[PDB]
Structures are given as C-alpha cells and as structure tokens.
Ligand binder design. Structure first.
Ligand SMILES: [Mg+2]
Length: 116
C-alpha cells in the first residue's frame, strides 16, 4: 500500500531558515544595489516573490541596480519576501505601492491600494 506525509510547518520553516541565511549572508547569490546600498539575497526567494525578478535574473549578472525605489522601501519589501511580514510607516504606503506595482507583488499592491 501507499504512504503519505504532510508537514504544514515546512513552507513556513523553510522560509524561516532562508531569512536566517540572508541575515548571516550564507549562500547568497545576488546583490541588489539601491541608491548605492548593497543587499545580498537569494535569487530563488526574490524570483518566486516577484515576476519582475524572475525575468531579470535570466541575465545572470549576479548584480543588479534598481532605480524605482529607495533602500528603505526595498529593505521593507525584502523583509516581506523573507518573513511574509511587512512593517512600514503610513507615510511610506505610496512608495511601497509604486514599487509593489513594478515588482508585481499582488498582495502588497492589493493592500496598499485598499489602504489608500
Ligand atoms: Mg534611486
């Protein structure tokens, strides 16, 4: 007979380790520059979070500069991507919507749209 196992804590635990890796900078494979500020991250997490990054990463530069947002906004979207949670001042909502729109993060775009 067949056997089956399911762990509903895997997706979340997996993302948790990934964030822990990004904080220690372990196995990072891409550098995103934002206003002369370097961010080390994982292509896979970013590409699965944003269709914009999925497309962009087919260049294989391992290094990319973003001009549509400030390092603060990016750090804000990086945290969301790695923790599924975003913290931001009400005064940043516009900045986030503009970037979420370009990055195509449906959830951030939806929420920011409602909140405004
Ligand atoms: Mg800039």
């Amino acid at each position: 007979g067949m056997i089956q196992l399911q762990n509903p804590s895997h997706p979340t635990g997996l993302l948790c380790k990934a964030n822990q890796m990004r904080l220690a900078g372990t196995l990072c494979d891409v550098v995103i520059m934002v206003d002369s500020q370097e961010f080390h991250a994982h292509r896979t997490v970013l590409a699965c979070t944003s269709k914009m990054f999925e497309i962009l990463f087919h260049r294989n530069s391992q290094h990319y500069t973003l001009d549509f947002l400030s390092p603060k906004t990016f750090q804000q979207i990086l945290e969301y991507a790695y923790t599924a949670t975003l913290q931001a001042k009400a005064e940043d909502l516009d900045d986030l919507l503009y970037a979420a729109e370009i990055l195509e993060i449906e959830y951030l775009e939806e929420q920011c749209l409602k909140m405004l």
